[PDB]
């Protein structure tokens, strides 16, 4: 029962942590007010509002209820722990253990939900690591970071794959892309996106000065490349008409030229290269298709750009961790967790930071 006791001890702590991250009291309050609103009969006259409210409530309730359960179950276990120990009734002890297991599972589920809420959080990811402005030192730092990440992934269970790597001409790596396969790999790693700040005395400096180099990690999920579906005949408007200049009676009469147009987009493609109307149409059609693709790509680009801009707006806040190896302290800047075992962290003990980050939702 020593292990069991230990587990029990842990679980309370875990629960507390969860509560802290959740902001449990606030949630409870929200649930209360929402519940009250629901109870009031005037809310269901406006349909859109009411459903939304209902949606809001339920999740909150679940969050609160689960927490409450966690409080109780542990207590029960503790109570029954005594029985297991002193009174020496076996069945009762077993029951207690079972309860604990169930409770633990429940807790895990809630925490899992909290952590991996995003759409692509289940998928595999591409970790991209890029060295900073320093030079050799920066490159070295980047390399170290990469190594750490690899160590982490392996520990987790994930399958790493060095897709591309640019090496530093002296030492370290200039840049590297790593495919990290496994379940909830993106959701586990997405938090590590950001700028990482090393501080240490440079071995590559002849002066041996303290250097503060930066290096970026950037985790993005493997999105499925959706197929480019062909446009419909209903969406297109197809003119045919005479061509410019040319030569003859036949040419004057016949309507070989073809102008295809998208009704949704207002794009057009003409063609009158060929004599054959059909050929022209085919060419024109192809052109139209190409144009649509280009428009889709443009759209994709624009959206991406917006996101990039938004990210930039955070600025100095893109710096997520601080690895001080002179004074031997790692600090995560957003969550605030610290550790003096820098070496260990480097080797790949990021769980402490990562988990916290996940809990936070940052």
């Amino acid at each position: 029962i020593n292990p069991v006791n230990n587990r029990i001890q842990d679980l309370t702590e875990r629960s507390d942590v969860l509560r802290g991250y959740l902001d449990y009291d606030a949630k409870k309050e929200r649930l209360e007010e929402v519940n009250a609103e629901l109870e009031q009969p005037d809310v269901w006259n406006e349909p859109e509002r009411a459903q939304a409210l209902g949606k809001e409530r339920s999740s909150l309730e679940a969050v609160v209820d689960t927490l409450d359960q966690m409080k109780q179950g542990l207590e029960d276990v503790s109570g029954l722990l005594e029985l297991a120990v002193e009174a020496d009734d076996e069945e009762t002890f077993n029951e207690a253990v079972a309860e604990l297991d169930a409770l633990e599972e429940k807790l895990a589920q809630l925490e899992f939900r909290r952590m991996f809420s995003g759409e692509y959080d289940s998928a595999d990811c591409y970790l991209d690591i890029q060295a900073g402005s320093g030079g050799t030192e920066a490159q070295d730092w980047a390399s170290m970071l990469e190594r750490m990440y690899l160590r982490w992934a392996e520990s987790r269970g994930f399958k790493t794959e060095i897709i591309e790597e640019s090496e530093g001409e002296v030492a370290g790596i200039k840049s590297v892309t790593i495919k990290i396969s496994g379940d909830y790999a993106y959701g586990w790693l997405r938090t590590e996106t950001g700028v990482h700040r090393l501080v240490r005395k440079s071995p590559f400096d002849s002066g041996g000065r303290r250097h503060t180099s930066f290096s970026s990690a950037f985790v993005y999920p493997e999105v499925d490349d959706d197929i480019d579906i062909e446009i419909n005949p209903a969406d297109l408007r197809i003119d045919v008409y005479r061509t410019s200049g040319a030569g003859g009676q036949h040419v004057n009469r016949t309507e070989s030229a073809v102008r295809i147009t998208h009704i949704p987009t207002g794009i057009v493609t003409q063609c009158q290269n060929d004599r054959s109307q059909h050929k022209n149409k085919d060419q024109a059609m192809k052109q139209m298709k190409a144009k649509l693709y280009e428009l889709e790509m443009q759209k994709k680009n624009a959206e991406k750009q917006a996101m990039e801009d938004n990210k930039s707006d955070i600025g100095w806040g893109s710096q997520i961790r601080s690895y001080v190896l002179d004074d031997s302290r790692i600090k995560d800047l957003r969550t605030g967790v610290e550790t003096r075992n820098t070496q260990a962290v480097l080797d790949g003990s990021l769980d402490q930071f990562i988990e916290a980050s996940l809990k936070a939702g940052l």
Binding site: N35, L38, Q40, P41, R57, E61
Partner: protein, 135 residues
């Protein structure tokens, strides 16, 4: 005259979230019904839902008679299972004995529409089957 069965567990006094507008749709107040329920409850047991007749007269002091607790909940209790409906024939989630079912049946005999308890038992069995559990 506004009679409908619509309520959650008995111990939860004044169900604001689940029922809410439904019980206080007609002229009768929110306080009264809840109070009545509470009064009813203490004679037996909490935790389980219980249905009751809601004949809302013009005077507002409504007449009411309790019914037996629902069957499904009872079945669940008997089982010691929470969810046992998903994919019933493809893989059996839960299972119950006939004797237990029979025992369960006899306790609801006041409200149950039958003289022969055998019939009641078989009904219960059928209900259980419907849920997902194989007898």
């Amino acid at each position: 005259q506004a009679y409908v069965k619509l309520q959650v567990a008995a111990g939860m006094a004044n169900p604001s979230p689940p029922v809410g507008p439904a019980l206080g749709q007609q002229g009768v107040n929110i306080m009264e019904f809840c109070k009545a329920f509470n009064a009813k409850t203490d004679s037996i047991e909490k935790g389980l839902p219980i249905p009751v007749v809601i004949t809302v007269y013009a005077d507002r002091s409504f007449t009411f008679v309790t019914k037996t607790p629902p069957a499904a909940v009872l079945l669940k209790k008997a089982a010691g299972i929470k969810s046992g409906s998903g994919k019933p024939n493809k893989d059996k989630v839960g299972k119950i004995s006939r004797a237990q079912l029979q025992e369960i049946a006899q306790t609801k005999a006041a409200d149950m529409t039958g003289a022969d308890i055998e019939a009641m038992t078989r009904s219960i069995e059928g209900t259980a089957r419907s849920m997902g559990l194989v007898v």
